[PDB]
Amino acid sequence: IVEGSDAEIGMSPWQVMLFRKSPQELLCGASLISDRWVLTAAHCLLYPPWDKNFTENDLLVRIGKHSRTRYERNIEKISMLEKIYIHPRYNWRENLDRDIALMKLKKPVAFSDYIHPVCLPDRETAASLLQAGYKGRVTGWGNLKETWGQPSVLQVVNLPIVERPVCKDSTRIRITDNMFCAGYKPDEGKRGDACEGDSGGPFVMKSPFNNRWYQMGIVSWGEGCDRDGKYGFYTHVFRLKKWIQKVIDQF
């Protein structure tokens, strides 16, 4: 996260760390959506051009964290993966369309002050909140700068959803209805973006109607980080919710 701020304790209790076992490193962010299911971006687990194809046994999920590198004894919980499910129509060839994946955990994770699931939007949540100018929240342990460092604790930044033509006009990549983009325009002066290591983490919004946090987006892609005239792109969770339900209902 670039031009973000240190998160508060328990501010993002659905935040998940995807952690590679060996060599031990941060893989991506992710989200807790119930006691045995984690939501992330497909490209975190499968990206053939770079020969990325992680199996269940290649990683762990870490829940309840605040500190990036510390093992947070008595706070964080670490779970093993039972099975990974990638959207079968995820388009890794062209544009990361349908950049979404689920992971089922071996055992249910116990909720705590630090561990708690986020809600998923329904049609009206989406219709009500996913409007240009409405701000959402992105969190992660990724890079603080496009090039140079890394944070000691979880970072947070709030960013406004952007008009679809402006999103369109900022990139040569073909944009689909299953993506949205968020961020400040050069005129606004305020800054912020996701960056390397933030992938797969949540874009959330707090409904003013019921005071709950909903995950509207998944950090998907962009070009560099916090560049002027560029915007972060996010997977449209509500648009892929039929698949999410399908998988959870089936498995």
Partner: peptide, 27 residues
Amino acid sequence: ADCGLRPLFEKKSLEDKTERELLESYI
């Protein structure tokens, strides 16, 4: 469900330092 209600904010009626920025943008 209790989804989306944080034990250390919503459940105890505490606000974090920047959620109002969000609220303020929802028209």
